[PDB]
Amino acid sequence: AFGITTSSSAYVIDTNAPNQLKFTVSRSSCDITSIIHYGTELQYSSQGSHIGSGLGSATVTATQSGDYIKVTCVTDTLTQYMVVHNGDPIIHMATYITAEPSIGELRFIARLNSDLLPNEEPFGDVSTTADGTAIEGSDVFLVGSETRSAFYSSERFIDDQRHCIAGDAHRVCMILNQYESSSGGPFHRDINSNNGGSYNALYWYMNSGHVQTESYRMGLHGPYSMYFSRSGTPSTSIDTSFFADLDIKGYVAASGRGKVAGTASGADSSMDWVVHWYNDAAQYWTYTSSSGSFTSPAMKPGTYTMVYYQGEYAVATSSVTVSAGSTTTKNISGSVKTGTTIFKIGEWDGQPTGFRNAANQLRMHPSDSRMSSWGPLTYTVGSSALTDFPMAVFKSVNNPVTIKFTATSAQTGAATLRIGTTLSFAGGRPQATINSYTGSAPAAPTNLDSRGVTRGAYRGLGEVYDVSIPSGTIVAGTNTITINVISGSSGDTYLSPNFIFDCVELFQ
Numbered sequence: 001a002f003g004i005t006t007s008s009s010a011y012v013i014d015t016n017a018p019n020q021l022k023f024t025v026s027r028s029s030c031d032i033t034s035i036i037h038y039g040t041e042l043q044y045s046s047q048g049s050h051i052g053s054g055l056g057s058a059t060v061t062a063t064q065s066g067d068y069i070k071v072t073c074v075t076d077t078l079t080q081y082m083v084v085h086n087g088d089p090i091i092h093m094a095t096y097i098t099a100e101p102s103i104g105e106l107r108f109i110a111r112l113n114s115d116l117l118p119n120e121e122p123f124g125d126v127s128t129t130a131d132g133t134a135i136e137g138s139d140v141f142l143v144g145s146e147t148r149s150a151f152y153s154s155e156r157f158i159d160d161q162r163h164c165i166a167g168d169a170h171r172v173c174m175i176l177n178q179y180e181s182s183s184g185g186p187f188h189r190d191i192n193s194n195n196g197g198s199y200n201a202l203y204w205y206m207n208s209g210h211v212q213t214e215s216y217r218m219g220l221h222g223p224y225s226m227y228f229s230r231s232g233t234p235s236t237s238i239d240t241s242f243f244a245d246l247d248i249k250g251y252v253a254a255s256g257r258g259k260v261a262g263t264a265s266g267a268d269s270s271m272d273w274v275v276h277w278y279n280d281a282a283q284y285w286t287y288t289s290s291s292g293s294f295t296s297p298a299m300k301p302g303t304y305t306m307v308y309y310q311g312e313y314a315v316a317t318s319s320v321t322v323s324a325g326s327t328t329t330k331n332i333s334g335s336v337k338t339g340t341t342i343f344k345i346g347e348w349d350g351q352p353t354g355f356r357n358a359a360n361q362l363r364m365h366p367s368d369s370r371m372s373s374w375g376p377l378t379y380t381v382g383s384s385a386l387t388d389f390p391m392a393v394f395k396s397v398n399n400p401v402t403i404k405f406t407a408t409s410a411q412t413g414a415a416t417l418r419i420g421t422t423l424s425f426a427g428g429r430p431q432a433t434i435n436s437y438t439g440s441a442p443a444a445p446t447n448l449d450s451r452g453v454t455r456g457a458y459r460g461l462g463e464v465y466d467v468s469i470p471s472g473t474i475v476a477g478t479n480t481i482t483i484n485v486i487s488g489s490s491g492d493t494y495l496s497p498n499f500i501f502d503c504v505e506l507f508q
């Protein structure tokens with residue numbers, strides 16, 4: 001029967017789902033300590049499923065409102081909610097914070113039976129670290145000769161509405177339709193799953209210090225929903241609007257939200273376009289249609305910074321105000337401006353897309369034997385393919401990058417060498433030499449204090465470095481550009497100072 005069973009130690013919640021879903025919540029800790037799906041225990045027996053590494057102690061209550069049951073767990077600065085609807089095999093959740101947890105990240109982890117749920121979806125075993133030996137920190141491993149990490153399960157949040165773990169008789173999915181309280185914008189990615197050897201972990205990292213570019217946001221995180229299937233795969237269309245009737249701290253219902261709608265224009269139409277709104281309270285985003293039209297998700301009222309990207313490259317920024325129950329009409333327009341191009345390596349998309357090892361890097365470590373050589377490599381304009389240009393340069397692996405190009409007599413005037421990047425590590429930034437002319441040494445970028453290129457990530461502050469080349473420095477015939485990564489810091493191999501490339505363009 002749909003309902004709550006009360007004992008001194010626990011509430012047992014029965015969803016009355018057709019294929020059976022019951023779970024046990026500790027009244028002392030709020031840990032989920034048992035999950036029974038289709039007659040089978042799925043919860044790891046030695047450690048609970050919970051926020052963080054457990055709330056430890058919480059004040060727990062459970063109540064039924066019609067066809068809904070709500071479990072509430074209160075701690076000093078965090079309240080955790082679990083909500084179920086009669087007939088649905090889903091644990092809906094939301095997490096209300098008034099301070100960031102002491103660990104400096106906010107996550108939910110389901111620790112589930114890895115014999116029953118060995119697989120990770122959609123990326124497969126690249127985040128399976130079971131039987132692995134650590135090669136970096138305690139989070140990148142060698143399993144046989146293949147590099148593995150929880151991080152290689154990651155996906156851009158704008159594209160991460162569903163991720164799962166599964167076996168041949170059960171599947172468990174996170175369905176994530178509300179990232180408004182997360183940090184780092186639409187292109188932030190984070191750990192999604194990890195079969196680590198004792199259990200298979202399924203996560204939602206609401207926020208973290210993993211290549212974090214923004215401050216944390218307080219308030220209600222989610223809703224998020226954990227769906228239990230036999231062999232089906234659930235749709236991401238899951239109504240959670242019933243949260244409006246359950247006195248959920250921080251919950252702002254549809255009626256309390258407005259929207260922004262309009263058309264973006266001017267950017268590179270061969271790229272996907274994204275519009276992004278943010279302020280200290282909330283962040284939102286949407287893809288535009290091919291015509292540039294967009295409508296934001298339902299937004300909390302307030303004033304927001306509004307950004308228009310082609311790929312992940314920002315072409316315009318504006319400001320807009322939203323009020324409840326109304327649509328603010330707001331267009332946005334811009335384009336990437338350079339000049340008359342002598343050569344261009346890559347595209348202005350805020351990514352290392354097309355470069356050597358870029359596709360591999362999302363799903364394996366740079367030391368993996370399956371990576372192509374990092375270099376030093378010499379890219380000759382007009383002969384080399386883009387996959388011969390390294391996606392990143394590391395002070396102590398493949399420094400420097402050399403570019404050879406031919407110029408005509410009509411191209412020997414003044415020019416600008418533009419070195420666009422995505423993400424730095426340990427102070428890495430470029431210093432360029434063009435023939436016998438040496439550009440100034442830029443200052444160190446802002447330190448994000450996080451590994452990234454070794455953990456399947458590339459979305460940083462997108463620093464761009466221009467070098468002014470005087471007329472008569474380019475010569476008719478062959479020319480040589482050397483890009484060195486400079487930094488006062490040091491490191492072993494891929495932890496040496498480094499940056500990931502976006503695009504290198506020489507224009508007049």
Ligand SMILES: [Ca+2]
Binds near residue numbers: 348350351352
């Ligand atoms: Ca690029």
